[PDB]
Amino acid sequence: YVGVEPDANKLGVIAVAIEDSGAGDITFTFQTGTSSPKNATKVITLNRTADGVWACKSTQDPMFTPKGCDN
Amino acid sequence: FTLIELMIVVAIIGILAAIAIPQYQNYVARSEGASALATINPLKTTVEESLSRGIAGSKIKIGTTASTATETYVGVEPDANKLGVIAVAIEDSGAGDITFTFQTGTSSPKNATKVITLNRTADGVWACKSTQDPMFTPKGCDN
Amino acid sequence: FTLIELMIVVAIIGILAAIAIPQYQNYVARSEGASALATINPLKTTVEESLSRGIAGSKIKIGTTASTATETYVGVEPDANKLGVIAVAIEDSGAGDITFTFQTGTSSPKNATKVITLNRTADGVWACKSTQDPMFTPKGCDN
Amino acid sequence: FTLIELMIVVAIIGILAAIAIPQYQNYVARSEGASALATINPLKTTVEESLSRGIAGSKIKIGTTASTATETYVGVEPDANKLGVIAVAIEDSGAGDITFTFQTGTSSPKNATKVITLNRTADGVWACKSTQDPMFTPKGCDN
């Protein structure tokens, strides 16, 4: 267990879904009512392939997307 | 506290993130293969020596039980290496193989359920065969 | 300075907080276990070699004192690793164990007062036993 | 989050970097040379024994084919060691050499395309010659 609650960050919940093959993603979905309207219902995904390659994908606006995460 | 102070902090937080994380499961898989090969390699000496002294191939087992004049034990448990179990199956003719099968739950997903086989023919020729990926296969073992 | 400026700063301060901090003591405990095992693992070679050359088991001690033809010292202090002390107690028959006991005040609370034992039987069979938690126990050591 | 917190993190990141990495290819080259020499060293026993029993030098080959009363095989594949291939070329007069040529794609760049030769004269004198660098040349082999 990662040691934190899904709602530890009030901005949104965190979901960890890793398959048995090693492929999976870690998502942070901003929730309406606790996040700014621009970032509401946006997802930041840390996708991991079965080969162990980590990539960051974000559905936010390109201006608001943090560095190192593709949009 | 000023907004420029906090915006600089946010910018440095973003810069300190985005650090690219290279692949690392290949290193773990290669180390697991090397560890398995180094675990089952000395068992070749035990089998060959026992066959040289006349001990029957069916009497060469794996375990910590004290080896007698007629029975030989390799001196290690089958699960001594947590990566997988070790099986020794030598026939009376001298033909046999030593296998290291990685077990799910204690080995990396790439190497899970893979077998490294040290096949011995009846003529005394030793060969190493591995079912892992060619990149993860240790040197000296055919794939 | 405007109140909207300061309220935006307060909001960004709150947002920059609330960053979830995952568990980290497990990593420290696992690293401590690995370090202890790597510290006491080479001592197996010293004991086995000294027993092979005929040096009495009671003469195999731990310390930096120059080993003579009859006495053997592992070459490291008992407190060489600050995590805990190392004790070598080999009987004359060849049976003995090498223990690494973590000491309170220099080791993590999870691993404190835990012992990693490399037990050797009179028949020359080496086994690793650890009293730590099963999650923190290094591979190859039974719990 | 404060700017002093982040600047301390940046400073510790910089300090944790800058760790000098010493040379390591020399170790790999030396280990490769030692492994090659240990691979081709036992083949001296096979050639000498076969010549002593009267087997023709041209009949001493390398492979896992079952050796007959007239033909002798060393029992290993030419590519048994992934570092390079092994070639046995003994003349009928007894003169010959055993070569280990490192192959590009499986050996370190320093040792690539280098040959370790165990030359045998017609008088039965064994000598080791290596084309590697003098630092990487294993002991007992002239450069």
Nearest CB neighbour to C125, from listed B2, B75, B81: B75
8 Å CB contact between A4 and C20: yes
Chain A partners within 8 Å of C19 (Cβ): 9
Nearest to C100 by CA among C58, C57, C54, C137: C137
- Residue type at C12 in one-letter notation: I
Helix (H/G/I), strand (E/B), else coil: D67: coil
Residue D29: C-alpha distances to residues B69, B95, B139, D101, D134 (Å): 44, 36, 15, 14, 11
What is the Cα–Cα distance from B113 to B84, expressed in whole angstroms?
A: 9
| Unique residue bearing structure tokens 């559905």 | A59
D24 touches chain C (CB under 8 A): no
Classify residue A62 as left (phi > 0), alpha (psi -120 to 50) or beta.
alpha
D81 with B125: Cβ contact below 8 A: no
- Residue D83: alpha-carbon gap to chain centroid: 7
Which residues are within 8 A (CB) of B88 and not within 5 positions of it... i.e. 6 or more apart?
B43, B47, B60, B61, B62, B74, B96, B98
- Residue A52: alpha-carbon gap to chain centroid: 17
8 Å CB contact between B18 and A66: yes
Long-range contacts of range C109-117, CB-CB < 8 Å, 24 or more positions apart? C109/C25, C110/C25, C110/C26, C110/C28, C110/C29, C110/C136, C111/C29, C111/C32, C111/C33, C111/C83, C111/C136, C116/C33, C116/C36, C116/C37, C116/C40, C116/C141
Nearest CB neighbour to C22, from listed A3, A10, A11: A3
Give the gap in angstroms from C-alpha D83 to the nearest C-alpha of chain C. 29
D with A: 3 or more CB pairs under 8 Å?
Answer: no
β-strand pairing of D96-102 with D84-90:
antiparallel
SS (H, E, C) chain B: CCHHHHHHHHHHHHHHCCCCCCCCHHHHHHHHHHHHHHHHCCHHHHHHHHHHCCCCHHHEECCCCCCCCCCEECCCCCCCCCCEEEEEEECCCCCEEEEEEECCCCCCCCCCCCEEEEEECCCCCEEEEECCCCCCCCCCCEC
Method used to solve the structure: cryo-EM
- Residue A16 — φ and ψ, nearest 5°? -115, 120
Strands (E), C8-83: 60-61, 72-73
Which residues are within 8 A (CB) of C71 and not within 5 positions of it... i.e. 6 or more apart?
C55, C59, C61, C65
Tokens of B44: 């070749």
B16 with D6: Cβ contact below 8 A: yes
What is the Cα–Cα distance from B27 to B36, expressed in whole angstroms?
A: 14
Q: In what order do the strands lie in the sheet with A24-30?
A: A12-18, A24-30, A43-48, A54-58
- Residue C32: alpha-carbon gap to chain centroid: 6
Helix (H) or strand (E) holding C14: helix C3-16
Q: Kindly give the interhelix angle for B3-16 and D3-16, rounded to the nearest 10 degrees.
A: 30
Chain B partners within 8 Å of C12 (Cβ): 3, 6-7, 10
> Could you count the other beta carbons within 10 Å of the beta carbon of residue D98?
26
